[PDB]
């Protein structure tokens, strides 16, 4: 049984980044050849493990993540690498075994009023610590007032919208994102190739 | 990026309309301000995005862009408006300014005020002196301001300042300053002081006196 | 009011190390995207350094390890440690601290940072004191003047702050002999050249210099 890396590069929306979609596939043989079949993956990227040696070695999981973010944050989706996106929205841990795959989604995402469900988060106390996930609607403000939840001086909305819209160019253009990562545990291995 | 403000120089009168045109090198979308700086005092923010003019502004700057080239709008030009505005983008990381456009207002000619001021006697005793000839109320910066030296023409010992625009009355101050050591101020004794005016009147001449 | 007193700095020897103080009112530092421009005298305002609400830090290029940024919790104070200065560096600094998309600003008064070899001197003081062609019927101007002072900047007050009608000083000059000069003058009604009595006040706030002279008519 191969595995489902369909309903995962073709899915008809993708996460936003603040709920950023993680996913499991697990005992399945699964080539990565199925793949390089339709992304002209801005920035394949692959760190460490290469293209060739993966249809070869076997490991318990493959977690995929999904997101989308605009053209010039896709650098930023790396391992090592400080923004609004991988600080306060995901961030891939230091060391990393995986691929990260972008492709221009302009005519799916981009909504010519702007699409306002795809969603960053502007402001938070603390970066985010690795693979950690975080969704609230909760106020930041800059002075004392605890403010109530209103909008008004010193309190604001977190998240903010992409406002993507298809006469806009490259750099604010919907890019989604897959960051597939390999898990090896102690448990006898069960995703081969 | 290589932000381009056009307008570096413009004039207009007394509640006119104008308009500056910022211009960049890429895609900034809508995330470029607009400041005002007045003169020493710092900067003020008056349209946030290129298209949100922040509110207790007075409401006639508008401004309106995307993508590349923005643009920026006075509708009324209040006498109190004199100042320097700079366009700014917030978003790529090497955030870089633009160049000002220094705004000034326009009115008639005024006729200056000439006053001249003679070095004290302990500068003097003190081997250094200080000759200066003050112009006030004149119209415009520009202006034929020459010295007189035994005859001769006289370049390369002269300085000017000239002070900023005022804001409500719109005149402008100009002082030169001349200095001589003890040697040279004991063996000579007549120093003028004369500027035309673009007013046509009669050529001011400044005299004075050593005894008083 | 966000009101900012960033007030650190007048100057070092080329290599020195200056430490700048931002500061704070309405807000606490460590909540809100700050930034630090540079305005050269006479040049547009170049951007130096700028802090995130989690600690994040971004230099230009000409400051890529002289320059160091740090957030203060304790007391706001948004720190900047300029270190490995240079002959080039001679700017006025403002503190600013940008909400990035919702809009509002604060942009301190700023402090100047001149930084040089050159040695402080005292400025030279001396009285205009207005001559008797004055007008009989018009009005006559004096003012005072102060020569040869080092380094920036200079503030003339008359009558301890109670007099700004007429008041006109004039901007620094560079002198060929390394040290700026300035001219204030005022322009007063005759009638209250006998009754009330002028004085001028030069300051000078780096070598904490305070002379007063008083001036009467001739």
Same mark, same amino acid.
């Given at each position: 049984? !191969?595995?489902?890396?369909?309903? @995962?590069?073709?899915?008809?929306?993708?996460?936003?980044?603040?709920?950023?979609?993680?996913?499991?596939?697990?005992?399945?043989?699964?080539?990565?050849?199925?793949?390089?079949?339709?992304?002209?993956?801005?920035?394949?990227?692959?760190?460490?493990?290469?293209?060739?040696?993966?249809?070869?070695?076997?490991?318990?999981?493959?977690?995929?993540?999904?997101?989308?973010?605009?053209?010039?944050?896709?650098?930023?989706?790396?391992?090592?690498?400080?923004?609004?996106?991988?600080?306060?929205?995901?961030? !891939?841990?230091?060391?990393?075994?995986?691929?990260?795959?972008?492709?221009?989604?302009?005519?799916?995402?981009?909504?010519?009023?702007?699409?306002?469900?795809?969603?960053?988060? !502007?402001?938070?106390?603390?970066?985010?610590?690795?693979?950690?996930?975080?969704?609230?609607?909760?106020?930041?403000?800059?002075?004392?007032?605890?403010?109530?939840?209103?909008?008004? @001086?010193?309190?604001?909305?977190?998240?903010?919208?992409?406002?993507?819209?298809?006469?806009?160019?490259?750099?604010?253009?919907?890019?989604?994102?897959?960051?597939?990562?390999?898990? !090896?545990?102690?448990?006898?291995?069960? @995703?081969?190739? | 990026?290589?932000?381009?403000?056009?307008?570096?120089?413009?004039?207009?009168?007394?509640?006119?309309?104008?308009?500056?045109?910022?211009?960049?090198?890429?895609?900034?979308?809508?995330?470029?301000?607009?400041?005002?700086?007045?003169?020493?005092?710092?900067?003020?923010?008056?349209?946030?995005?290129?298209?949100?003019?922040?509110?207790?502004?007075?409401?006639?700057?508008?401004?309106?862009?995307?993508?590349?080239?923005?643009?920026?709008?006075?509708?009324?030009?209040?006498?109190?408006?004199?100042?320097?505005?700079?366009?700014?983008?917030?978003?790529?990381?090497?955030?870089?300014?633009?160049?000002?456009?220094?705004?000034?207002?326009?009115?008639?000619?005024?006729?200056?005020?000439?006053?001249?001021?003679?070095?004290?006697?302990?500068?003097?005793?003190?081997?250094?002196?200080?000759?200066?000839?003050?112009?006030?109320?004149?119209?415009?910066?520009?202006?034929?301001?020459?010295?007189?030296?035994?005859?001769?023409?006289?370049?390369?010992?002269?300085?000017?300042?000239?002070?900023?625009?005022?804001?409500?009355?719109?005149?402008?101050?100009?002082?030169?300053?001349?200095?001589?050591?003890?040697?040279?101020?004991?063996? =000579?004794?007549?120093?003028?002081?004369?500027?035309? =005016?673009?007013?046509?009147?009669?050529?001011?001449?400044?005299?004075?006196?050593?005894?008083? | 009011?966000?009101?900012?007193?960033?007030?650190?700095?007048?100057?070092?020897?080329?290599?020195?190390?200056?430490?700048?103080?931002?500061?704070?009112?309405?807000?606490?530092? /460590?909540? #809100?995207?700050?930034?630090?421009?540079?305005?050269?005298?006479?040049?547009?305002?170049?951007?130096?350094? %700028?802090?995130?609400?989690?600690?994040?830090?971004?230099?230009?290029? /000409?400051?890529?390890?002289?320059?160091?940024?740090?957030? &203060?919790? %304790?007391?706001?104070?948004?720190?900047?440690?300029? #270190? %490995?200065?240079?002959?080039?560096?001679?700017?006025?600094?403002?503190?600013?601290?940008?909400?990035?998309?919702?809009?509002? &600003?604060?942009?301190?008064?700023?402090?100047?940072?001149?930084?040089?070899?050159?040695?402080?001197?005292?400025?030279?003081?001396?009285?205009?004191?207005?001559?008797?062609?004055?007008?009989?019927?018009?009005?006559?101007?004096?003012?005072?003047?102060?020569?040869?002072?080092?380094?920036?900047?200079?503030?003339?007050?008359?009558?301890?702050?109670?007099?700004?009608?007429?008041?006109?000083?004039?901007?620094?000059?560079?002198?060929?002999?390394?040290?700026?000069?300035?001219?204030?003058?005022?322009?007063?009604?005759?009638?209250?050249?006998?009754?009330?009595?002028?004085?001028?006040?030069?300051?000078?706030?780096?070598?904490?210099?305070?002379?007063?002279?008083?001036?009467?008519?001739?």
């Amino acid at each position: 049984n !191969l595995c489902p890396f369909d309903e @995962v590069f073709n899915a008809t929306r993708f996460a936003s980044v603040y709920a950023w979609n993680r996913k499991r596939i697990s005992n399945c043989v699964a080539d990565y050849s199925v793949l390089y079949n339709f992304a002209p993956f801005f920035a394949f990227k692959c760190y460490g493990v290469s293209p060739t040696k993966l249809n070869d070695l076997c490991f318990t999981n493959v977690y995929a993540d999904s997101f989308v973010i605009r053209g010039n944050e896709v650098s930023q989706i790396a391992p090592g690498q400080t923004g609004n996106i991988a600080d306060y929205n995901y961030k !891939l841990p230091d060391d990393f075994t995986g691929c990260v795959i972008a492709w221009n989604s302009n005519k799916l995402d981009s909504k010519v009023g702007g699409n306002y469900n795809y969603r960053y988060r !502007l402001f938070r106390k603390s970066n985010l610590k690795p693979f950690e996930r975080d969704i609230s609607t909760e106020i930041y403000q800059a002075g004392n007032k605890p403010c109530n939840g209103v909008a008004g @001086v010193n309190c604001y909305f977190p998240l903010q919208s992409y406002g993507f819209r298809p006469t806009y160019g490259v750099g604010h253009q919907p890019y989604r994102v897959v960051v597939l990562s390999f898990e !090896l545990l102690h448990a006898p291995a069960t @995703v081969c190739g | 990026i290589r932000m381009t403000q056009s307008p570096a120089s413009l004039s207009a009168s007394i509640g006119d309309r104008v308009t500056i045109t910022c211009q960049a090198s890429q895609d900034i979308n809508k995330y470029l301000n607009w400041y005002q700086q007045k003169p020493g005092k710092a900067p003020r923010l008056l349209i946030y995005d290129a298209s949100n003019l922040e509110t207790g502004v007075p409401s006639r700057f508008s401004g309106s862009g995307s993508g590349t080239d923005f643009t920026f709008t006075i509708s009324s030009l209040q006498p109190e408006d004199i100042a320097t505005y700079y366009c700014q983008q917030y978003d790529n990381l090497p955030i870089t300014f633009g160049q000002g456009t220094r705004l000034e207002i326009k009115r008639t000619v005024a006729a200056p005020s000439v006053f001249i001021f003679p070095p004290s006697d302990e500068q003097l005793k003190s081997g250094t002196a200080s000759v200066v000839c003050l112009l006030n109320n004149f119209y415009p910066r520009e202006a034929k301001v020459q010295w007189k030296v035994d005859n001769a023409l006289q370049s390369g010992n002269s300085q000017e300042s000239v002070t900023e625009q005022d804001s409500k009355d719109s005149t402008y101050s100009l002082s030169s300053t001349l200095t001589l050591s003890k040697a040279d101020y004991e063996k =000579h004794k007549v120093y003028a002081c004369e500027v035309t =005016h673009q007013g046509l009147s009669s050529p001011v001449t400044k005299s004075f006196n050593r005894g008083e | 009011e966000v009101q900012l007193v960033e007030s650190g700095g007048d100057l070092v020897q080329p290599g020195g190390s200056l430490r700048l103080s931002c500061a704070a009112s309405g807000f606490i530092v /460590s909540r #809100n995207y700050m930034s630090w421009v540079r305005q050269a005298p006479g040049k547009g305002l170049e951007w130096v350094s %700028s802090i995130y609400s989690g600690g994040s830090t971004f230099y230009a290029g /000409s400051v890529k390890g002289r320059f160091t940024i740090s957030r &203060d919790n %304790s007391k706001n104070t948004l720190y900047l440690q300029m #270190n %490995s200065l240079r002959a080039e560096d001679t700017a006025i600094y403002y503190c600013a601290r940008d909400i990035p998309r919702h809009g509002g &600003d604060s942009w301190g008064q700023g402090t100047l940072v001149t930084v040089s070899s050159a040695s402080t001197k005292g400025p030279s003081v001396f009285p205009l004191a207005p001559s008797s062609k004055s007008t009989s019927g018009g009005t006559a101007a004096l003012g005072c003047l102060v020569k040869d002072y080092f380094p920036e900047p200079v503030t003339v007050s008359w009558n301890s702050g109670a007099l700004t009608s007429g008041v006109h000083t004039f901007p620094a000059v560079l002198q060929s002999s390394g040290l700026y000069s300035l001219s204030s003058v005022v322009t007063v009604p005759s009638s209250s050249l006998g009754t009330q009595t002028y004085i001028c006040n030069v300051n000078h706030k780096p070598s904490n210099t305070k002379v007063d002279k008083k001036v009467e008519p001739k």
